[PDB]
Amino acid sequence: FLPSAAYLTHQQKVLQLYKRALRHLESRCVHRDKYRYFACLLRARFDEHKNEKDMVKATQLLREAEKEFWHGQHPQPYIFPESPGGTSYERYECYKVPEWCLDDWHPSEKAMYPDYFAKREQWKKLRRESWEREVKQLQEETPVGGPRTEALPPARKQGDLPPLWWHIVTRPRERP
Amino acid sequence: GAHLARRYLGDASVEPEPLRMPTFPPDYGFPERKEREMVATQQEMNDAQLVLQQRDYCAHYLIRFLKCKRDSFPNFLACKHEQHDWDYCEHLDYVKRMKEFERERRLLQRKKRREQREA
Amino acid sequence: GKRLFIIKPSGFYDKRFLKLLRFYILLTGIPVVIGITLINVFIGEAELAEIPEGYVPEHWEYFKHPIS
Amino acid sequence: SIFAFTHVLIPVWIIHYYLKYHVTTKPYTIVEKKPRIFPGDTILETGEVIPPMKEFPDQ
Amino acid sequence: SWDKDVYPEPPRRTPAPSPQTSLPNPITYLTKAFDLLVDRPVTLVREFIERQHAKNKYYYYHREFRRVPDITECHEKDVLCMFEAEMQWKRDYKVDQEIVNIIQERLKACQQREGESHRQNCAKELQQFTQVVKAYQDRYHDLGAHYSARKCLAKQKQRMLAERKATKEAA
Amino acid sequence: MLKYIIPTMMLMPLTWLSKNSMIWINTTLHSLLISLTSLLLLNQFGDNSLNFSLTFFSDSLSTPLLILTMWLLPLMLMASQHHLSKENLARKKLFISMLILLQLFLIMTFTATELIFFYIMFEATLVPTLIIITRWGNQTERLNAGLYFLFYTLAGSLPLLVALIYIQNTMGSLNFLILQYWVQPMPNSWSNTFMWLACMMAFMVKMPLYGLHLWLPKAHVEAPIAGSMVLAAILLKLGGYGMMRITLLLNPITDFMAYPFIMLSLWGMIMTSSICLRQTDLKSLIAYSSVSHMALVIVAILIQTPWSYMGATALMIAHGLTSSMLFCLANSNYERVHSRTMILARGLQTLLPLMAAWWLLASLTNLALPPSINLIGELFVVMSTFSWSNITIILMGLNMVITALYSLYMLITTQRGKHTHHINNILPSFTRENALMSLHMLPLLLLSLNPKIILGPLY
Amino acid sequence: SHITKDMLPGPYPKTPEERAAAAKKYNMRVEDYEPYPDDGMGYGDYPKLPDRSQQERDPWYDWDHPDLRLNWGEPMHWDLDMYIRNRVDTSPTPVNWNLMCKHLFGFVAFMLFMFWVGETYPTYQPVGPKQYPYNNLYLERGGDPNKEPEPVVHYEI
Amino acid sequence: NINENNPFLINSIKRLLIGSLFAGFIISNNIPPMTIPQMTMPHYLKMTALTVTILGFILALEISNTTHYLKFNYPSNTFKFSNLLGYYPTIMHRLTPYMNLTMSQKSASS
Amino acid sequence: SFPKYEPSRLASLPTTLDPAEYDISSETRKAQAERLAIRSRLKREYQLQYNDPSRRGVVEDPALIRWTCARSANVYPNFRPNTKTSLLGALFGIGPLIFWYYVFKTDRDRKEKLIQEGKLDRTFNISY
Amino acid sequence: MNLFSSLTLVTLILLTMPIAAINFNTHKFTNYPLYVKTTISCAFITSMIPTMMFIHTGQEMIISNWHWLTIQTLKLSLSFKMDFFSMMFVPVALFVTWSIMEFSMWYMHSDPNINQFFKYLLLFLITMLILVTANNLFQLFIGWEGVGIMSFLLIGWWYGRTDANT
Amino acid sequence: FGFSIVLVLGSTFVAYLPDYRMQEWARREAERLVKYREAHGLPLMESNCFDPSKIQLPED
Numbered sequence A: 001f002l003p004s005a006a007y008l009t010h011q012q013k014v015l016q017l018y019k020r021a022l023r024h025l026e027s028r029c030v031h032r033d034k035y036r037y038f039a040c041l042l043r044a045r046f047d048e049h050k051n052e053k054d055m056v057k058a059t060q061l062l063r064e065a066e067k068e069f070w071h072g073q074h075p076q077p078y079i080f081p082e083s084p085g086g087t088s089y090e091r092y093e094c095y096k097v098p099e100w101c102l103d104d105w106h107p108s109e110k111a112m113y114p115d116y117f118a119k120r121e122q123w124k125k126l127r128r129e130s131w132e133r134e135v136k137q138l139q140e141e142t143p144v145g146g147p148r149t150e151a152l153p154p155a156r157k158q159g160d161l162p163p164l165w166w167h168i169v170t171r172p173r174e175r176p
Numbered sequence B: 001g002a003h004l005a006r007r008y009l010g011d012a013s014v015e016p017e018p019l020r021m022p023t024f025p026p027d028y029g030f031p032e033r034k035e036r037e038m039v040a041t042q043q044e045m046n047d048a049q050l051v052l053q054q055r056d057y058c059a060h061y062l063i064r065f066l067k068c069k070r071d072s073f074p075n076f077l078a079c080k081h082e083q084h085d086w087d088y089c090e091h092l093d094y095v096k097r098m099k100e101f102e103r104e105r106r107l108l109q110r111k112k113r114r115e116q117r118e119a
Numbered sequence C: 001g002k003r004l005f006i007i008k009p010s011g012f013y014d015k016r017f018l019k020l021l022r023f024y025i026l027l028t029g030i031p032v033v034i035g036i037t038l039i040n041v042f043i044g045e046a047e048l049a050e051i052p053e054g055y056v057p058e059h060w061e062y063f064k065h066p067i068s
Numbered sequence D: 001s002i003f004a005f006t007h008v009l010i011p012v013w014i015i016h017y018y019l020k021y022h023v024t025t026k027p028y029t030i031v032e033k034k035p036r037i038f039p040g041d042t043i044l045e046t047g048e049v050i051p052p053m054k055e056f057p058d059q
Numbered sequence E: 001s002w003d004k005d006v007y008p009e010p011p012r013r014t015p016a017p018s019p020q021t022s023l024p025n026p027i028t029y030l031t032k033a034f035d036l037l038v039d040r041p042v043t044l045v046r047e048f049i050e051r052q053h054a055k056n057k058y059y060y061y062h063r064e065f066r067r068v069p070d071i072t073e074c075h076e077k078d079v080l081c082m083f084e085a086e087m088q089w090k091r092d093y094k095v096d097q098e099i100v101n102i103i104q105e106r107l108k109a110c111q112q113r114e115g116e117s118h119r120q121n122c123a124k125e126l127q128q129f130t131q132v133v134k135a136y137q138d139r140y141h142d143l144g145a146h147y148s149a150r151k152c153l154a155k156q157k158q159r160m161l162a163e164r165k166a167t168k169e170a171a
Numbered sequence F: 001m002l003k004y005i006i007p008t009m010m011l012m013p014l015t016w017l018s019k020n021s022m023i024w025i026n027t028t029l030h031s032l033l034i035s036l037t038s039l040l041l042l043n044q045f046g047d048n049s050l051n052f053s054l055t056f057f058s059d060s061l062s063t064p065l066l067i068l069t070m071w072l073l074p075l076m077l078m079a080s081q082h083h084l085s086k087e088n089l090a091r092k093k094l095f096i097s098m099l100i101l102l103q104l105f106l107i108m109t110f111t112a113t114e115l116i117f118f119y120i121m122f123e124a125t126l127v128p129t130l131i132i133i134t135r136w137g138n139q140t141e142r143l144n145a146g147l148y149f150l151f152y153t154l155a156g157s158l159p160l161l162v163a164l165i166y167i168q169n170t171m172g173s174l175n176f177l178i179l180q181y182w183v184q185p186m187p188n189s190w191s192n193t194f195m196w197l198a199c200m201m202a203f204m205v206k207m208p209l210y211g212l213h214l215w216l217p218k219a220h221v222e223a224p225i226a227g228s229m230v231l232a233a234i235l236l237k238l239g240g241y242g243m244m245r246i247t248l249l250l251n252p253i254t255d256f257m258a259y260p261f262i263m264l265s266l267w268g269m270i271m272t273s274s275i276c277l278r279q280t281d282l283k284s285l286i287a288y289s290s291v292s293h294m295a296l297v298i299v300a301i302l303i304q305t306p307w308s309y310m311g312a313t314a315l316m317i318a319h320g321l322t323s324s325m326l327f328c329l330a331n332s333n334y335e336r337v338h339s340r341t342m343i344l345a346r347g348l349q350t351l352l353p354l355m356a357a358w359w360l361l362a363s364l365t366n367l368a369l370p371p372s373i374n375l376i377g378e379l380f381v382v383m384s385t386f387s388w389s390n391i392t393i394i395l396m397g398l399n400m401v402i403t404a405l406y407s408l409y410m411l412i413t414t415q416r417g418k419h420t421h422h423i424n425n426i427l428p429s430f431t432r433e434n435a436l437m438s439l440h441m442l443p444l445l446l447l448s449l450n451p452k453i454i455l456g457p458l459y
Numbered sequence G: 001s002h003i004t005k006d007m008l009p010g011p012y013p014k015t016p017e018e019r020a021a022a023a024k025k026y027n028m029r030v031e032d033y034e035p036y037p038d039d040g041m042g043y044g045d046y047p048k049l050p051d052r053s054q055q056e057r058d059p060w061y062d063w064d065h066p067d068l069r070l071n072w073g074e075p076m077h078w079d080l081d082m083y084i085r086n087r088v089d090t091s092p093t094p095v096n097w098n099l100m101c102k103h104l105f106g107f108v109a110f111m112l113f114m115f116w117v118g119e120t121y122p123t124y125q126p127v128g129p130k131q132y133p134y135n136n137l138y139l140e141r142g143g144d145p146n147k148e149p150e151p152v153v154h155y156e157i
Numbered sequence H: 001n002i003n004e005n006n007p008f009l010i011n012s013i014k015r016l017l018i019g020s021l022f023a024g025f026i027i028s029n030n031i032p033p034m035t036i037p038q039m040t041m042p043h044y045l046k047m048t049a050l051t052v053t054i055l056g057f058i059l060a061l062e063i064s065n066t067t068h069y070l071k072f073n074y075p076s077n078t079f080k081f082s083n084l085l086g087y088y089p090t091i092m093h094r095l096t097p098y099m100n101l102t103m104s105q106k107s108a109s110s
Numbered sequence I: 001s002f003p004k005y006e007p008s009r010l011a012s013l014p015t016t017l018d019p020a021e022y023d024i025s026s027e028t029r030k031a032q033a034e035r036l037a038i039r040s041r042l043k044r045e046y047q048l049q050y051n052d053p054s055r056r057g058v059v060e061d062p063a064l065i066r067w068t069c070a071r072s073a074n075v076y077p078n079f080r081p082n083t084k085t086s087l088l089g090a091l092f093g094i095g096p097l098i099f100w101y102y103v104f105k106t107d108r109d110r111k112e113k114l115i116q117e118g119k120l121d122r123t124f125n126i127s128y
Numbered sequence J: 001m002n003l004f005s006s007l008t009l010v011t012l013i014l015l016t017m018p019i020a021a022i023n024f025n026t027h028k029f030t031n032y033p034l035y036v037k038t039t040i041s042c043a044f045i046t047s048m049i050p051t052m053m054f055i056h057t058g059q060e061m062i063i064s065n066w067h068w069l070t071i072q073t074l075k076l077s078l079s080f081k082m083d084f085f086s087m088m089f090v091p092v093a094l095f096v097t098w099s100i101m102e103f104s105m106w107y108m109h110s111d112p113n114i115n116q117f118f119k120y121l122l123l124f125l126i127t128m129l130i131l132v133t134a135n136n137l138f139q140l141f142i143g144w145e146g147v148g149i150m151s152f153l154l155i156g157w158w159y160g161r162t163d164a165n166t
Numbered sequence K: 001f002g003f004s005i006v007l008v009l010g011s012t013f014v015a016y017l018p019d020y021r022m023q024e025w026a027r028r029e030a031e032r033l034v035k036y037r038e039a040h041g042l043p044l045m046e047s048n049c050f051d052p053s054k055i056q057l058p059e060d
Helices: A010-028 A033-047 A056-070 A091-095 A107-112 A114-129 A133-139 B003-009 B042-047 B060-071 B081-118 C011-026 C030-042 D002-025 E026-053 E079-114 E123-139 E150-170 F002-016 F023-039 F062-079 F089-110 F115-135 F142-157 F159-168 F191-206 F215-221 F225-246 F253-257 F259-275 F283-302 F306-336 F355-366 F373-388 F393-414 F431-449 G017-025 G098-120 H007-029 H048-067 H078-083 H087-109 I026-048 I062-071 I083-117 J002-013 J017-023 J032-057 J084-088 J090-107 J114-133 J137-155 K007-015 K024-039
Strands: D031-033 J060-065 J078-082
Touching (some): A010 A033, A010 A056, A107 C011, C030 E026, C030 K007, D002 E026, D002 J002, D002 J032, D031 E079, F002 F023, F023 K007, F062 F089, F089 F115, F089 F225, F115 F142, F115 F225, F142 F191, F142 F215, F191 F225, F225 F283, F259 F393, F259 I083, F283 F306, F283 F373, F306 F355, F306 F373, F306 F431, F373 F393, F373 F431, F431 K007, G098 H087, H007 J090, H087 I083, J002 J060, J002 J114, J017 J114, J032 J090, J084 J090, J084 J114, J114 J137
């Protein structure tokens, strides 16, 4: 369930296991120095059988490693206050008013803010002028009838903006 | 305490069951020992609007403590010795209740083992 | 440089409806409050007299407050 | 100064006007649990003593 | 005003506090300041308003009724007899509900005046409360929402006939 | 009452020979003047009712419902543009005149002296609502909804006429006083049981109770806002009004025969409050809410306590106001996004900052907020039913818990947390919608100050 | 403006045409399409999914609808109103489920059992009654002012 | 950027520490006695409050000095029982939202 | 050292220990690739209907409309009354109703018999 | 008694004027936190006095007025009293909430929705005060569900954050 | 004509009017009648609101 590929990798799965076990050992192990000791012990335990030339033995050790990890996890791991489940986790989703709005104002409030609305007008002209031919030709020129991936190509032909940029550039500041 | 351990581990008789306390009657070994003065003047005890379950023995000291505490208010720490005296009189009341307890206990133990071992 | 443009959606219609609501309630809120106050401070409520001998009241003169 | 003026004078005036006349012309209205009187006092209203308690001893 | 014999009040009992020691007494200064800042101006305002009231003179009278005879003297159908009968009964019902309201307010006032000793000088009012409310429970209670007057007289007949059978068994 | 009948007639050719873009102002202004004149009625005193003829008379049950009808007319007549403002002048005038004629038969029905006249004006109220919801239903099953509405309400309501003719020619006339002052008990035979089942089952259809309630939600989700609000508020509370009047006869047999209807109403109140917790189709939640609250009303009517009748009429009036307003907010959100669903139109705390106050205040008047009239009604019904039996208060409080749960879920679903950021058509809130919300809420709070009006006959 | 044949009458049979139509219609893989089956509980031919799907779907994929975990073209499992975050979280628990309910019900049974053992076996300090002066504090109980003067006295010990 | 050079914060904390030092005694002393104070306890019934709090401090300080060590002991499920908020929130909030709504879709809805 | 992690209907089986993810067929690789193709085509069509500056209204998600008409109107077809459907219908529809009806009959008969004897606490029971 | 009843009623009535300030606002304030803090300070400094009179004399009281729906044998008014608990609790709550007004000037300074926050929190104080003054049990029920729903709103202050509205 | 002449004038109209359903008349009449029945010995609210002189029971 990832945008660029279908399966992660074997190495990617071992690597996610390593980051999750190291994070849970952070949360388990306070005072940071016994943490550093146990983290180097874990790094050594990965080093002792990292260089095995098989593949079914690699997935064997991976599967038993998930067993002996899920035995020893921590109930409330220290997740950061931006991660899902965290303390904040879009705390300031109260104030992410999107920018398809702000055009439905009365013109007196538009007369209070001259320069920002003039520059929004020139950005909106830049959106409307460079939408049809360039973006739709690059989106209906390079793909096959099945796209088979979600990475979209940059604009490297001659000039202007990359395709499908508007609701990725004009997103809110995430600390308004 | 220790009375609880004796009452829940030993026999059923010689430790008396509470809240059914008068088992032997009074004046069993008293004869002519009773004062029960009660100098509290019940009508004026009604007049000072006391709480129920305070209209008891050692309540005149409560009346005096309430009187001095009302009559000298902005001294936050005015009445100490009369409140101490009221605590002392309630200590005398608690001692008297404990005396009633162990009176009925010793009567029950000695007299009932006398009767039910020499019957 | 420290200040930035903050985004809030369209407070003008909010303020216009709120101003019109308070004004067109208080257009005859204050005159009626002045009217009822001048009544019950400059006309009297009533007294509680008994019915006099050989006399009839109507269907008013049974009620305390004079606007009632 | 003006804040304490308006908010400890105007609602106090409005409520204390409200509580004398309307409130105490309605009969069963504001009622107070009576002051306790003690056997050494004297009644302020009419003027007569309350008899003191008797002798203390055996404490 | 009000009659002192329908909403009764016991006489006042107020002590004279004898201060033992001398701090003295913040609330005495504060109540004198309260008198001078509140008691004088509201009295002057009320006296002005009372002079403006007593310039003219309104009067409201109390509405009074007669005694239309009975429901026991009305016939089979006779709708212009039962009408006056049942409206007279319904006005008795309203004024009797307010009798119950007066007695229950007396019970509340006896609770709050007598303080933390409830059972002193509230036995008489609780006695008359249980008396009048026993009368109400006997007389108006178990008839429901579509009372007109006739279910009350049916309850009257049924109750006295049952007590007639009870005293016949008691004979 | 003729002074209220005849200007309702005279307000109809107003709409015809007023010119283009001037029918609106004249009808709104004159119906609001009718609302003031309606509020001048409230004279009713003490001993008797008031008689505005041998043809018209008003109990104190009928007074707040009548003022509710003549107050809900101009609110609706303003509420029903922007989905027919682009339509024709003739069809627009026909719609407005249809609402005026429906008001006329509702006034006919609420000041009905005779029960025969009450039945005729009952189904005369039934007539124009089918035409309204079918011609402007704006969905594809409006035919099914109007047809189920018609045949349910007739086929339940119809042997009621036969029972009323039988009472007409076995006891003389059917004025409510001479039906009263003469009513004799009717013993536990079987023909009396069928007469009771005919009358009470006709109104059971009209409320509805649980076994007959799928009548309602199609007729609300597949109907315009005018037919929805009039249908819910005035037609269901008119059915309750009718049961209140006709239950004065048949005094002894209701104890014998009125247990299973209490049962079906209670258990279906619980099941209906449970079914409106998990649905989509935002309009339908208020419909099943109305089914739950009128099942509570039915329990309140069939037990026969004065506390129960006071709580019943208070619950009727408060729920009529609340459910009509909440229908109107649902139509406002549907005009914002052409969805009718619930999980789509998310966000709306950030955008539309003032609409949150009306959603919250309507959801709290549906929550039984404690100084409001809704909790006054529900509280007296709970008191009376715990006097009925010591065990049935569990179902009442479980209804209370689930009612708070689904109402506040309906709040925090549509209008809490994240705009879906692909909507980008919603405009800021008009003055019209907020004027409608202020016309709904402010009479309810001002009755919450002084509810001696809306408590009915047994005040 | 919507096709009448994008709704869903009838169950799975027959196997080539209706399964091909449902797989093209629900944007699903052919072997991933599963009807319920047709036990007659309604349900049409709406697919069966792995049924939990909302405390999964790790939130760093950055799909369209962020607080719904949908992606505009998923078949939207039949019980989704019961499955949103703020309704039901079927996360993989840190312990178990059966072992959890065993420990909880055993602990609640132990606490109520020890409360019953307490309620049959109280503690008390060694102390008689509270002795009340005037006839077990008569005339300040329920009343009867002249009916029952009950003779009971206390003695000093 | 740890910061308390701040008027309102130190005023509020100041006002409530002045509160929680004196106002407990000021409130708890000048009230009319509406009950009978016990005041006659044996030994080890009045001392027992301070005794239990001191033995608790010794117990927690030795747990702290074992936290100073480095052993990494596995949990033994009483750690889980005290760590997962008790099993009551997880068990009840996964059962009773699932049971009521499973019986709402099958029985009530469809 | 593992208690094998028994699953339930509420404790979901996590993505780590399946353990069917660790013995892989090539057809599962083909399935994951085609599933990625389906989601990529759906996101491509959505993003092209999403960033048009001329577009004003909503995007008209067909899966949501399909689910809504599947959940509301398309329950009644298809349906046949089976033994399971009739049994569960008469169980959930009539059973608890007749149970609470039995207990209300029991409580009302006890209460009316008890006040026919008259030994209730209606010494004052005014607000009935 | 004049002073005792009048000062209890003005301690109740000072917590209605800032709601009038936001309702009749029409030109948005900036010192509205300062206004709410100083009116809570004034409410405490008028709530200290009748408690001092209570300990100094005794003299408990009830007030009861404006009866609405006096229908059957019962009648219910706005009826609230001050006894031992009922006015020994109120200055503590006002003092605590005035310190929280200080700390919520500071902590919530950087969020531009502060006025609606102090509106909600003042209304919450009003409802809990109505709960701790009343003797009519229906008025206790009013204070009960009112503090329940203000607790709902103040828990779900941060919209977004599905943990909060859960 | 929906607020300034309807809502506020309706509030003043049904704010006070004649005593609806005869409440304050019932207060004053009950005050007078309780004063009478307490000043004349008999218990207030004698039961049997219809006089048993004016009743005729069917015999047995």
